[PDB]
Design a protein around this ligand. Structure first.
Ligand SMILES: CCCCCCCCCCCCCCCCCC(=O)OC[C@H](COP(=O)([O-])OCC(O)COP(=O)([O-])OC[C@@H](COC(=O)CCCCCCCCCCCCCCCCC)OC(=O)CCCCCCCCCCCCCCCCC)OC(=O)CCCCCCCCCCCCCCCCC
Ligand SMILES: CCCCCCCCCCCCCCCCCC(=O)OC[C@H](COP(=O)([O-])OCC(O)COP(=O)([O-])OC[C@@H](COC(=O)CCCCCCCCCCCCCCCCC)OC(=O)CCCCCCCCCCCCCCCCC)OC(=O)CCCCCCCCCCCCCCCCC
Ligand SMILES: CCCCCCCCCCCCCCCCCC(=O)OC[C@H](COP(=O)(O)OCCN)OC(=O)CCCCCCCCCCCCCCCCC
Ligand SMILES: CCCCCCCCCCCCCCCCCC(=O)OC[C@H](COP(=O)(O)OCCN)OC(=O)CCCCCCCCCCCCCCCCC
Ligand SMILES: CCCCCCCCCCCCCCCCCC(=O)OC[C@H](COP(=O)(O)OCCN)OC(=O)CCCCCCCCCCCCCCCCC
Ligand SMILES: CCCCCCCCCCCCCCCCCC(=O)OC[C@H](COP(=O)(O)OCCN)OC(=O)CCCCCCCCCCCCCCCCC
Ligand SMILES: CCCCCCCCCCCCCCCCCC(=O)OC[C@H](COP(=O)(O)OCCN)OC(=O)CCCCCCCCCCCCCCCCC
Ligand code: HEM
Ligand code: HEM
Ligand code: HEM
Ligand code: HEM
Lengths: 52, 116, 77, 388, 60, 31, 388, 115
């Protein structure tokens, strides 16, 4: 388990995040005074950067 | 004169058309009164019970959602709609009467419209 | 019996996986299906082709309008 | 939320005002494509300003060189024909989209409270647009430009006390001549910037109270931000307008024009048909229809009096005409009458056009004289149709 | 679907590559549309162009 | 930092391509 | 406080923004008259705009008619000599007031944080003023006008790869002829409105971060409202400026100019002494002093780079010059250097003026290169002078 | 560095600063604007309320005198401590904390807002 854990480096983290996070679909569940929480398109757009 | 749909065919047709439109969008005739419009409607809505005002806001939100989606209420709730079942005219009349009395004898306006 | 719990309260207290959307002017995809994310991006890419071409046209038209004219070009001998 | 460190460059003070008033300003989620015309008149104004500046780099305001300079832009300048056709047909487009703006406002009763200042600033903008377009149309110095300027400025001598004095001061002499041309050019250059300022005040007032909606109801329950939901809607509007404008530039560049303007102005000869541009035609028609020309100028003033008096009418709690069948029919009759009256303006002043224009003006003013009555009578609807 | 996803993973992972692709596509599409419209013009009005009059060089 | 350098180089390439497309100096480019 | 019924018109939404930013803006209680100079520069800009509009009602942008049109304004137009002298000498006073504005900023180190954006927008404003005044001076079309236009536009050829192309494109036809005249008239008419926009942004940024004071210290303890306390001070400044400007208009109107601009432009002969207006003379002197004209253009760019690079210095803790004897002396030396530099630009290139200019420009950049050193040493001061 | 007690020029500079600062009744540390550095802001927040309030009182007095175009009376000028600082130690501590935080992977605790 320790070998598997410390076999994770920065490049591995980037590759896994690009596999799971970059431009994927989020699922939001909210309750309460959420009248100021941004809508779905906001999060879906925030899942990627246009600078890079 | 006072022309009501019982004594006027034209008034009957007018009321029928208004009922059809309001039922299509599912909102009572009193819901069309804008609080920003008069500021007497604002006071009358401030004096009404919270259940009634919340129902008004819910009906208005439903109507606006239907307007955006470009559709009408389904025929079931359309047959369940009750336009012209007023909830505001009596309170608005009371507020306007009180304002008229206050203006008539001395008195400063309790509320005023900003410029603009 | 007596309560007749409200619609929103019943919806909050009873989450279900059989979610129903409007589907009036936007029909759903069947629940198990990949999202056509790339196709929309390529449509937008074609539109951006057009927009860039139009911007380029307008800038060049104005700037070269400010440039020299056939009159002075013919006058120079 | 203590702003100890920066989160979003949109919320920084450099971009905070733009953030709020453009990206994050809440608008009703049910607006139709009729608000894109308000979004689009500004684009037309920007197009006019840019093309006008690049044209003014080539125009000469003298009386012996204006027409030849315009033809120089036509022929010698690279892309000059594009600039000139863009400027002319863009004035036409500006007026088209502004008319659509005005008529949507009339249909949905957007002039009603609390947007009286929005409507009044719109009327002032309309005055500025009319003056700018006229004084600009005098610039090419054709037959129609010269004689339209002569007729319209000479019809400012209807004021009783001053009259001739104001006309002489405005002409810079005794007739429409070089001084008037130079003066008109300078004023035409200046006025669009006041028009930009007036547009900014227009938008500031509207943003103070927020935009209306097709239902005309209070709409602070269901609202969404401007960007991106209405940005893409306005984008569709802009591209459709671009297709329309491209048709009107590249295939019918003179259809909206008048052929007599391609004749160098000749003060010793008058063209048989002196008429203004198509977008001054209803005003011209009312002016001609009312006889006793002083009365005509009074009627023209009364038109703007009515336009400014629209927002200050009686109760009329219901505003959208989707729930007002009688006002809906009245609005359609008004629009038909305005189109007919615009048609009348181009016609000669012979019969039966005189009577057709005299009835049309009366109907046009009857529209304004009937709406307060509609409001007063409809103030007592719920008490009559109630189901108690 | 597969083709669109493949070109997506080719040219839509960095915005700089996307901007380069947009500009290149705009240029190529502009040139292609130019060529097509010119061919339609030639097909439509044949026998009218400047280098077609039978006596173009005999005014001397 | 190496990733930042690569991103900056790619953005410079994109900007150069945009400027080249705007100016169209195909005639000028002799080398 | 719930605003149920309206108390004051100034707090109503129609006059609320104006109220805040004009009447109620808190201001340091110890401001001297140089803040009045800033307001005075604003007034000079407005005067220039108004007189320029009324002048452009009579100016013909053609090469064959510009000079005689200006003489028309002077001789025939009713009170036209007043308009022209007001425009010209008002350009001069605009530059005088802006120079005093800038030098007060330098003396009190108002460019320091957090007013870096204010200073940068000021630099942009100064660039716009330079361009506007230059293109305007080309308009009367005299010897100095034509030849100064020729020289200053032809020094744009110093760009390495695209210099000649830019020069030819800006000239429009291998010379500075009619095409350049029309181009310059349009640009001269357009630019002042961008200048107004830049001034508004300048004021907005300053109003964000308050205002400096002669002490350079934090000043939120003793602050007073702008009206009426600083309106009356600004009014005293305005009346004194009006007396100064009236001295210039009526009694010595041609002192601030050159007599060569009263000869019609003749591109054949060359006047023996080609210099710009007096307010471009320091820049002209720097550029002329550094030879190898590419180096001259690079040096002007370097001047503006230094001006933009002032705000972003490292330590610079103590702000005002009242507590900085070394920086006070450095500033006075810089001002003397700037005056000498301006005087050098009117002199021929014959010796010793080349040596004097090549020393003066170096001293200018030396001032711009030795402020951070003083800031660092001053940051080192407090742990040495402690009295215990 | 040979500033104090060994440089005639530095002695003259100190004399001039003492003259001016005591003339307006200020201290050197009072010249540090909180808006200038955003580290002076944190230091002033961390300082005791009595010290901060005295600083504000001195600043208000100096601004009042600058408005009135006059200086302190000779008595209060004599009773002056222009260089009895109160801010240098806290400012140095704040700067050192910032130094280590940037040294090993940390977000700034506060940043300047873009104007
Ligand atoms: C004034 C000129 C500048 C204006 C800038 C505005 C945006 C500022 C900004 O930072 O935005 C980022 C910001 C990104 O969102 P965020 O929440 O700040 O951060 C999201 C990510 O974390 C961070 O976002 P990200 O990492 O995806 O990138 C954001 C930004 C960040 O930029 C940087 O980091 C540095 C700059 C780029 C460097 C590389 C190049 O970088 C870019 O935008 C990349 C551009 C690349 C070059 C493209 C060519 O943009 C937006 O939120 C969208 C703004 C949309 C504005 C629309 C305006 C028009 C709509 C109304 C029209 C009404 C009618 C008009 C016509 C009427 C008649 C005339
Ligand atoms: C700041 C305010 C500066 C005001 C300068 C006024 C001005 O330009 O007067 C020259 C102007 C030129 O006329 P002129 O010299 O008789 O005729 C020119 C000939 O070529 C005969 O010329 P000249 O060879 O006899 O002497 C030419 C000399 C005029 O001779 C004199 O002035 C002699 C002394 C009186 O010209 C100059 O000194 C022009 C340059 C002076 C102004 C430089 C301003 C630099 C400000 C800072 C620039 C910073 C740049 C970067 C910013 C960031 O007027 C006068 O010299 C006489 C009136 C002086 C009134 C001074 C008090 C009111 C102001
Ligand atoms: C004189 C006019 C008296 C009108 C009296 C009330 C008429 C109310 C009415 O229902 O009118 C019929 C119709 C609108 O009603 P409706 O048929 O519901 O329209 C939408 C669906 N077709 O049509 C109208 O309401 C048209 C009314 C036109 C009024 C013109 C007045 C000049
Ligand atoms: C309250 C608002 C603010 C107040 C100000 C007023 C605002 C009014 C807003 C609407 C403006 C509409 C302007 C209408 C312009 C009409 C131009 C016109 O008359 O065109 C006529 C022309 C016919 O062809 P032509 O050969 O020129 O005619 C014979 C002339 N000797 O071309 C045509 O006929 C083409 C179509 C013209 C438009 C439709 C006309 C339909 C009715 C006419 C027949 C009846
Ligand atoms: C031409 C004018 C004809 C109508 C004259 C009477 C009048 O003004 O009635 C006002 C009222 C208008 O109703 P309206 O506002 O269109 O729709 C209901 C929402 N408020 O219309 C009515 O109430 C009409 C009822 C009687 C039918 C016509 C007589
Ligand atoms: C070349 C120029 C051509 C013309 C350009 C456009 C000219 C527009 C003229 C009108 C401008 C009026 C000011 C608009 C900006 C403004 O009011 O910004 C306010 C803001 C003050 O700062 P802050 O108190 O933080 O406000 C944001 C949160 N309240 O301000 C700031 O923080 C600084 C804003 C700087 C400008 C940003 C854009
Ligand atoms: C030939 C080639 C070489 C040319 C240059 C060679 C000489 C270089 C400079 C030599 C002299 C440097 C003097 C520096 C120490 C000043 C000491 C000081 O601050 O004295 C205090 C005095 C206070 O004045 P005050 O308050 O009136 O005094 C009454 C006291 N109860 O304070 C004062 O009086 C203020 C004096 C300020 C002087 C500032 C300018 C000189 C110092 C910097 C020189 C930089 C030169 C390059 C840049 C020039 C500007 C662009
Ligand atoms: C500052 C901005 C503007 C400038 C510099 C400008 C300048 C000019 C110039 C030089 C001409 C004469 C050239 C020509 O006739 O084609 C002209 C014509 C004209 N302008 Fe403008 N203009 C500006 C804005 C506008 C606006 C906003 C409108 C519309 C309201 C407008 C309407 C016209 C019209 C109708 C003509 C006559 C076109 C023709 O018939 O040939 N202009 N303008
Ligand atoms: C220069 C021309 C004009 C421009 C640029 C302009 C711009 C705008 C803009 C941007 C809006 C907000 C977007 C929208 O609601 O469509 C708007 C709304 C509005 N404008 Fe104008 N406008 C112009 C002329 C006019 C005129 C002539 C009038 C009437 C006299 C007018 C009356 C209104 C009204 C009533 C609204 C409110 C719309 C609503 O109901 O929400 N505008 N305008
Ligand atoms: C069109 C010309 C200009 C106008 C109308 C103008 C206007 C103003 C105004 C109204 C103020 C606020 C009142 C005041 O402090 O005097 C101000 C302040 C200021 N301006 Fe300008 N300005 C102009 C040019 C410049 C230039 C060229 C610079 C320098 C590059 C500059 C730098 C500053 C600075 C640093 C302040 C801050 C004032 C302070 O620290 O108390 N301004 N300006
Ligand atoms: C939009 C506003 C402006 C207009 C319409 C305008 C228009 C004109 C016109 C027509 C002339 C030539 C008339 C003449 O020869 O006296 C002129 C000259 C001039 N303008 Fe402007 N101007 C404006 C603003 C400015 C500004 C802001 C400046 C900068 C200080 C400026 C600087 C000059 C100068 C230096 C001259 C030449 C003075 C001379 O005739 O000897 N103008 N302007």
């Amino acid at each position: 388990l320790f070998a598997r854990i410390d076999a994770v480096d920065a490049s591995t983290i980037k590759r896994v995040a690009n596999r799971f996070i970059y431009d994927k679909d989020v699922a939001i569940a909210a309750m309460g005074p959420i009248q100021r929480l941004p809508d779905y398109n906001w999060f879906r757009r925030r899942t990627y950067w246009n600078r890079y | 004169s006072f022309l009501d749909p019982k004594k006027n065919w034209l008034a009957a047709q007018h009321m029928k058309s208004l009922v059809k439109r309001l039922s299509k969008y599912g909102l009572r005739y009193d819901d069309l009164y804008d609080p920003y419009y008069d500021l007497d409607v604002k006071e009358a809505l401030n004096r009404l019970p919270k259940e009634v005002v919340d129902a008004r806001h819910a009906r208005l939100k439903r109507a606006i959602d239907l307007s955006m989606k470009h559709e009408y209420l389904p025929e079931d709730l359309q047959a369940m709609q009750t336009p012209f079942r007023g909830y505001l005219q009596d309170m608005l009349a009371l507020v306007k009467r009180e304002r008229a009395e206050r203006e008539a004898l001395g008195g400063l306006p309790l509320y005023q419209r900003s410029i603009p | 019996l007596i309560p007749e719990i409200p619609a929103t309260v019943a919806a909050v207290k009873n989450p279900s996986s059989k979610i129903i959307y409007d589907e009036h002017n936007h029909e759903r995809f069947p629940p198990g299906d990949p999202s056509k994310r790339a196709f929309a991006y390529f449509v937008l890419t074609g539109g951006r082709f057009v927009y860039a071409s139009l911007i380029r046209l307008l800038v060049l038209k104005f700037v070269l309008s400010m440039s020299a004219s056939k009159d002075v070009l013919a006058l120079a001998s | 939320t203590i702003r100890n460190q920066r989160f979003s460059l949109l919320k920084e003070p450099i971009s905070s005002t733009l953030n709020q008033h453009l990206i994050d300003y809440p608008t009703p989620s049910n607006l139709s494509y009729w608000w894109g015309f308000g979004s689009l008149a500004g684009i037309c104004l920007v197009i006019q300003i840019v093309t006008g500046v690049f044209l003014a780099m080539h125009y000469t305001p003298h009386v012996d060189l204006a027409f030849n300079s315009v033809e120089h832009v036509m022929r010698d300048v690279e892309g000059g024909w594009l600039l000139r056709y863009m400027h002319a047909n863009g004035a036409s487009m500006f007026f088209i989209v502004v008319y659509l703006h005005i008529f949507r406002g009339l249909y949905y009763a957007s002039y009603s409270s609390p947007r009286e200042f929005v409507w009044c600033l719109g009327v002032v903008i309309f005055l500025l647009m009319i003056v700018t377009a006229f004084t600009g149309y005098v610039l090419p110095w054709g037959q129609m430009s010269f004689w339209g300027a002569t007729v319209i400025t000479s019809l400012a001598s209807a004021i009783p006390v001053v009259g001739d004095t104001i006309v002489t001061w405005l002409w810079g002499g005794f007739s429409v001549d070089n001084a008037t041309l130079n003066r008109f050019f300078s004023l035409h250059y200046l006025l669009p910037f006041l028009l930009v300022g007036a547009s900014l005040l227009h938008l500031a007032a509207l943003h103070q109270y927020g935009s209306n909606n097709p239902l005309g109801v209070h709409s602070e329950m269901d609202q969404i931000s401007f960007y991106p939901y209405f940005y893409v809607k306005d984008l569709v509007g802009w591209v459709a307008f671009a297709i329309f404008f491209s048709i009107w530039i590249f295939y019918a560049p003179n259809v909206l024009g008048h052929p007599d303007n391609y004749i160098p102005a000749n003060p010793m000869s008058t063209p048989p048909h002196i008429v203004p541009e198509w977008y001054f035609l209803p005003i011209y028609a009312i002016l001609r229809s009312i006889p006793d020309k002083s009365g005509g100028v009074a009627a023209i003033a009364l038109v703007f009096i009515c336009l400014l008096a629209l927002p200050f009418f009686k109760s009329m709690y219901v505003r959208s005409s989707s729930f007002r069948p009688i006002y809906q029919g009245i609005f359609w009759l008004l629009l038909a009458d305005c189109l007919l009256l615009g048609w009348i303006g181009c016609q000669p002043v012979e019969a039966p056009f005189v009577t057709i224009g005299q009835i049309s003006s009366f109907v046009f003013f009857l529209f304004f004289a009937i709406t307060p009555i509609l409001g007063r009578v409809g103030r007592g609807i719920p008490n009559s149709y109630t189901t108690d | 679907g597969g083709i669109f996803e493949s070109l997506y993973k080719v040219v839509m992972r960095r915005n700089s590559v996307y901007v380069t692709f947009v500009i290149a596509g705009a240029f190529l599409g502009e040139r292609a549309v130019d060529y097509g419209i010119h061919k339609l013009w030639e097909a439509n009005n044949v026998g009218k162009r400047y280098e077609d009059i039978p006596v173009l060089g005999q005014k001397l | 930092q190496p990733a930042d350098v690569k991103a900056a180089a790619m953005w410079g390439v994109a900007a150069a391509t945009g400027g080249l497309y705007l100016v169209q100096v195909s005639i000028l480019v002799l080398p």
